Design a protein that fits this description.
The structure is cut from a larger assembly and holds two copies of chain A.
Chain A lengths: L1 E3 L18 H14 L6 E5 L6 H10 L12 E3 L14 H18 L4 H22 L11 H5 L15 H16 L3 E5 L10 H11 L5 E7 L1 H13 L6 H4 L5 H20 L5 E3 L3 H4 L11 E3 L11 E2 H12 L6 H12 L2 H17 L3 H10 L3 H7 L10 H15 L15 H4 L2 H12 L4 H16 L1 H4 L9 H14 L8 H13 L9 E2 L2 E4 L21 H7 L3 E5 L3 E6 L1 H10 L6 H11 L4 E3 L9 H5 L3 H21 L4 H24 L16 H23 L21 H15 L11 H6 L5 H4 L9 H18 L6 H8 L32
Parallel strand pairs in A: 1-7, 2-5, 2-6, 3-4, 4-5, 11-13
Antiparallel strand pairs in A: 7-8, 9-10, 10-12, 11-12
Helix pairs in contact in A: 4-6, 8-10, 12-13, 12-15, 14-15, 15-19, 17-19, 17-20, 20-25, 20-29, 23-25, 29-30, 31-34
The structure holds one RNA strand.
Chain lengths: 851, 86
RNA sequence: GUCCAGCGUCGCUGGAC
């Protein structure tokens, strides 16, 4: 039972408290040390990596042994911590230890009160030091000398050594025995430090430990990394061979036992120095408590608000869940447990700092993700700098975010799920940067619609489209130089990371995917259809060129804003769904009066020309060759009026867009293949399921998009806390509007019983479903199925769509005419041209097959 | 400079034997790990300052750069006559 | 509508009456 606060009078950095939280670990370590000297190989290890707070722990046990209350006769006296790296080179460790040991004894010798005792010990203690210095010459010599033999036979006076000779190990052994008598203790503790700076500084430490610190009165604790300590031993074993033998016997079979013999020698060496039962590892707070369904052996309590009682504080696991869930607009479950699971594996020193920063600013501030990014920026700037992301403190924006998303997935080399930002990588340098990225997407996209579509259309989509062309060109693993160069051209072509318009990104996205024709070379691609620009010679039915001038009213304003002219070796005309999302994302950010949206609306409806990407054949020859709208404008201006109220309450999350596009990509991909096989000479006007048309494929792409946002928003968008879908299964519309009508009706009933509307909760779908631009696309002249079994499903669907928007969209005269089977009126809200437009590559002369 | 100094600590005799692709790549990461830790420990990340080049000072013709520089092409040339570096 | 002309491995595009 322990509680840790965040507000303290000293304003302590990182809020580590006093002696941290590892009291149970420390007391177990202290007892083992104390029990180890109850004899009537004291080498310990403290595992750690990447500065995980090892130095604080070793100091903590020092203050718990040099500040004892003299409770028990057995006592520990700790020398000051020795740092091999900072130690001056060409100085034996035994000399440094004795020098530091001298200060403790000499100061305690000065502290006596009995004059007779002080004079007796000083004479004897000073005698042992004079004995050691005589033998210190024997420790660092390059040659023997025959006059050292006389000193080897010099028998000790007033001292009895069981073995003759010099035996410098014995001289130090009797020196430490006296030092304990003066200090009245029973054991001496020597604390070493890391060697992560100087790799080879530890070889003198290892040799000294096994040579001179092997006795009963001495106990040594050493911290470090066993990788660093193992390559030293293995390397020094190879330097112990005859050099000539290593040049003659290298027949690859004699060498087989050369490597084996070194490892066997090295493995036994490590066990002798550091026994396995004397190794201690620090525990992160996750393995103490936090895993669901298990009662952890310890409980950690955290108080956030200033000055609460030690009884009403919140649990550590929930001290972060409330921060993460609402700081990233997550709700609960497998989506938010992963983020809080990874954060609990981090060192206790680091996490308590960011918790202190977030909670301190939260209480004083009374955007929440803005407080989560700033708190995390000042605690994980190391990994951002190492990972090559944008470590700028300020100068932020959406354009700079697109590269961050793209430059992160490339390092993770996983393009399928890169735009999920879920920390599943196997490197600790990247698992701490996804959290920072997931915080920025929440902050930037919270409370806007244009800022939501732009990041989805540009940042989120580029990781998926590029995966369709990596497999073909510049295979990754075969050659890194060409693969890395292709990415540089790709990111600089469509200007990922510095955008001029989301619509402009659509005018260039069409060309990038147009360069992958299938076997049949039909003019249909993923999310678009290729339209003829020149009239053909023969027309089997009522087919003709597009003739944009046929359309009128707002329907014409929906065609001009959906056409792109790719300038290949021969001019190509396209109609794409991606241009619509770009068109919406542009006008949705004017936020001004009518006068501004007279030009803002005008600029969206303009002919644009884009160049084939450089990584294509026609990159060189293409260069050589190369007021009725006032009513429509008025219709749009009302939409901007009631967007802003809904616009404020939107709160997207990182996982929401990841699931919006994943369903959007799969559904839109699955539309093209079904609608490309079934198209015949008399297949116009539809009226069944097999018959298809240019309008039908066009209308069905956007309907395949609104279904994607509808399903995911009610399940992941954070305004609500429950799913209004039920406990069934869900699919996507592929040829029928059935699945887009069944789901919307269920929400209409299961939500009406709870006394709520479509804008207080589940707001985003309401804005998309009700917009003047997309309205003509939903119900065109030739894309309506006409069958008695399925007319009612679409007829009921018209009212359901009308119910959500709350306004009439199709007059009964026009609605009947579209569904009339019979074969001069004017339409200003629906299109009449794509009913019989010409499709590129139509090579199916057979007609509709009966049965 | 640092990475060159870290290789010196490895015993020379160790580097002729055990030259296998798997072994060479094992120490190649470890040295680069000591490279970044030592460098980050010495100079903290939250204090390094990158000096802006001529581009960020000026910026693009249509974009906005947070400075303004004018040059001289005449002795005693009036400051009004000075023109942008572009 | 027919013609001239142009690009691609017939398909596609440009111009005029």
């Amino acid at each position: 039972k322990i509680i840790i606060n965040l507000f303290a009078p000293n304003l302590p950095g990182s809020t580590k408290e006093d002696d941290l939280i590892q009291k149970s670990l420390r007391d177990q370590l202290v007892e083992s040390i104390r029990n180890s000297i109850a004899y009537p190989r004291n080498v310990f290890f403290v595992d750690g990596t990447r500065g995980a707070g090892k130095t604080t722990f070793i100091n903590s046990v020092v203050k718990s042994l040099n500040s004892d209350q003299d409770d028990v006769k057995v006592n520990i006296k700790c020398l000051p911590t020795i740092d091999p790296t900072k130690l001056p080179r060409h100085e034996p460790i035994l000399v440094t230890v004795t020098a530091r040991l001298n200060k403790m004894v000499s100061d305690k010798l000065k502290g006596y009160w009995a004059s007779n005792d002080y004079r007796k010990q000083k004479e004897q203690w000073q005698n042992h030091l004079a004995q050691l210095q005589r033998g210190l010459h024997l420790l660092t010599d390059k040659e023997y000398k025959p006059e050292y033999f006389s000193d080897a036979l010099k028998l000790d006076a007033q001292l009895d050594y069981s073995i003759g000779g010099q035996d410098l190990s014995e001289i130090f052994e009797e020196l430490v025995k006296r030092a304990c008598e003066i200090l009245d203790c029973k054991a001496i503790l020597i604390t070493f430090d890391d060697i992560d700076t100087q790799f080879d500084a530890g070889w003198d430490v290892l040799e000294s430990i096994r040579k001179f610190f092997n006795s009963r009165k001495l106990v040594v604790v050493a911290t470090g990394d066993l990788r660093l300590y193992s390559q030293l031993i293995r390397g020094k074993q190879y330097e112990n061979y005859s050099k000539t033998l290593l040049e003659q016997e290298k027949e690859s079979v004699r060498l087989a036992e050369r490597g084996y013999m070194v490892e066997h020698l090295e493995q036994q060496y490590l066990l002798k120095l550091f026994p396995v039962q004397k190794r201690i590892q620090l525990k992160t707070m996750l393995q103490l408590v936090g895993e669901k369904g298990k009662a952890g052996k310890e409980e950690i309590k955290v108080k956030t608000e200033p000055g609460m009682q030690d009884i009403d504080a919140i649990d550590v696991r929930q001290a972060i869940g409330d921060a993460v869930r609402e700081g990233l607009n997550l709700r609960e479950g497998s989506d938010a447990d992963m983020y809080v699971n990874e954060l609990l594996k981090q060192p206790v020193r680091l996490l308590m700092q960011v918790l202190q920063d977030f909670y301190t600013k939260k209480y004083h501030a009374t955007s929440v993700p803005n407080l989560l990014r700033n708190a995390l920026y000042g605690s994980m700037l190391s990994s951002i700098y190492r990972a090559g992301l944008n470590y700028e403190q300020h100068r932020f924006g959406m354009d700079s975010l697109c590269k961050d998303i793209f430059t992160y997935v490339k390092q993770d080399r996983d393009f399928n799920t890169g735009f999920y930002l879920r920390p599943q990588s196997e490197s600790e340098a990247l698992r701490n940067c996804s959290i920072y990225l997931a915080s920025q997407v929440s902050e930037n996209c919270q409370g806007s619609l244009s800022k939501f579509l732009q990041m989805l259309l540009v940042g989120c989509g580029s990781v998926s489209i590029f995966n369709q062309f990596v497999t073909e060109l510049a295979r990754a693993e075969n050659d890194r130089e060409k693969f890395e160069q292709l990415i540089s051209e790709y990111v600089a072509y469509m200007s990922v990371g510095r955008i001029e318009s989301a619509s402009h990104w659509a005018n260039r996205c069409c060309a990038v995917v147009a360069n992958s024709p299938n076997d049949e070379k039909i003019g249909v691609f993923l999310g678009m259809v290729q339209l003829n620009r020149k009239s053909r010679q023969h027309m089997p039915g009522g087919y003709k060129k597009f003739n944009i001038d046929t359309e009128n009213g707002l329907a014409k304003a929906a065609m001009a804003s959906s056409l792109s002219t790719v300038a290949s070796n021969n001019l190509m005309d396209f109609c794409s769904v991606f241009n619509l999302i770009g068109a919406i994302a542009d006008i949705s950010a004017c936020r001004c009066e009518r006068s501004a949206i007279t030009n803002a609306f005008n600029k969206v409806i303009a002919q644009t020309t884009c160049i084939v990407p450089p990584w294509s054949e026609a990159a060189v020859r293409a260069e050589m060759k190369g007021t009725e709208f006032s009513d429509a404008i008025t219709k749009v201006e009302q939409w901007l009026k009631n967007v802003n109220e809904i616009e404020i309450g939107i709160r997207p999350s990182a996982l929401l867009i990841g699931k919006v596009w994943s369903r959007f990509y799969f559904n839109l991909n699955n539309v093209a293949d079904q609608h490309k096989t079934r198209l015949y000479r008399n297949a116009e006007h539809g009226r069944m399921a097999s018959q298809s048309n240019a309008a039908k494929i066009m209308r069905f792409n956007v309907l395949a998009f609104l279904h994607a946002v509808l399903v995911e928003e009610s399940l992941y968008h954070s305004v609500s806390d429950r799913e209004y879908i039920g406990e069934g299964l869900r699919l996507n519309p592929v040829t029928s509007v059935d699945e887009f009508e069944k789901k919307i009706k269920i929400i209409g009933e299961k939500l009406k019983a709870d006394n709520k509307t479509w804008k207080n909760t589940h707001p985003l779908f309401f804005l998309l479903i009700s917009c003047p631009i997309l309205h003509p696309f939903i119900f065109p002249v030739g894309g309506i199925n006409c069958s008695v079994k399925a007319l009612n499903k679409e007829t009921s669907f018209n009212k359901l769509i009308d119910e959500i928007v709350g306004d009439k969209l199709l007059s009964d005269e026009e609605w009947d005419y579209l569904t009339k089977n019979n074969d001069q009126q004017i339409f200003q809200n629906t299109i009449t041209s794509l009913n019989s437009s010409t499709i590129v590559g139509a090579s199916y002369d057979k007609d509709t097959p009966a049965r």
